[PDB]
Amino acid sequence: GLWDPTLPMIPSANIPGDPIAVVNQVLGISATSAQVTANMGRKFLEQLGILQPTDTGITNAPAGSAQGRIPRVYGRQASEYVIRRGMSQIGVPYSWGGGNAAGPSKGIDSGAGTVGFDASGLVLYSFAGVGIKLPHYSGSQYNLGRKIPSSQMRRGDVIFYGPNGSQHVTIYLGNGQMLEAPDVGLKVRVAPVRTAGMTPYVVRYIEY
Incomplete structure (x- = not known):
């Protein structure tokens, strides 16, 4: 079928725009995901020794392009940092x-x-560490980045499920x-890849 039958066979949560990400009610500040992401991206580019005054910190390639802000020679480092971030959330509730x-x-x-992650939330949290800004909806994530055939998926690529990548x-x-952040009552986890409902392409956000 069209869906991974182990999960709810509906589109994933679709949260619009640029949500507030940090609230500190004692200091009286708040800032959005795009703000936090830009800050992290600038930090990452500075640690590579390549920050420029034109850099906002947002590092996404134009969708479909093989050229993003992060140089290819640093892409494995960037990807491993993203994966590190995600893996650090193992055990956080869905x-x-x-x-x-x-x-x-x-x-x-x-x-x-419930304070936790859903699937697209975990992916956006992970990628934000290197300035890769992603919307909080799996289907919209699927339209960004560069498609790679699923048969050629590589560590750090992003796997999608459901029509238009809308499910997971x-x-x-x-x-x-x-x-993944799988379903209600579970935790962020490492699991075997499932092919049921998988889209025919994965998405690459970071080139190397």
Whole structure:
């Protein structure tokens, strides 16, 4: 069928725009995922010794382009940092709609009372570390980056499920394993890759 039958066979949470990611009610500040992501991207480019005054910190390639802000020679480093971030969230609860560029967060609808990640939330949190800004909806993530045939998926690529990649999204780890925020009552986990419902392409956000 069109869907991974192990998960709800509906589109994933679709959270619009640029959500507030950090709130500090004692200091009286707040900032959005795009703000947190830009800050992290500038930090990453500075640690590579390549920050420029024109850099906002957002490092995405134009969708479909093989050329992004992060040089190819540094792409493996960037990818491993993204994976490190994601893997550091192993054991955090799933929450439908949960997560932002700063970490897990309260979800929506069903996940309104649970601080955690959903699938696209975990992916956007992970990639935000190197300035790769992603929308909080798997289907919209699928339209960014560069498509790679799923048969040629590589560690750091992003695997999608459902029509238009609308159901679920995970980070491929290589060796037939993926990092995911799977479903209600579970935790961020490493799991075997599932092919049911998988889109015919994975997405690459970082070239190397």
